[PDB]
Amino acid sequence: KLQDSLDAGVGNLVDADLAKESAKLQSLQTKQQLGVQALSIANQSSSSILSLF
């Protein structure tokens, strides 16, 4: 009985909640996809200078 209590206590200390990690993973994947597109938008600046010359 004591060993079961100690195992449960350590698990309570260091375990995670995967239900929350799923939501965080979804939001972060969407944000990374948006960040790549934002970097692509930022790269195409200064390309309009060539028309002046």
Partner: protein, 54 residues
């Protein structure tokens, strides 16, 4: 953490209660087999010794 994948205390406590029930079943079955409460020296040392000597 209510969603842990490594451990769950419900299974542990269910196991403990099942083991307790099994122990009580063992005691009752021993009583039925031998037909008496104090059959060995583990049941009751004093009464068992008294009955043997008597």
């Amino acid at each position: 953490a209510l969603n842990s994948i490594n451990t769950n205390a419900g299974a542990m406590i269910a196991l403990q209660n099942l083991n307790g029930t099994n122990s009580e079943l063992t005691t009752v079955q021993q009583r039925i087999n031998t037909g008496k409460k104090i059959a060995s020296a583990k049941d009751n040392g004093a009464i068992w010794a008294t009955a043997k000597n008597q």
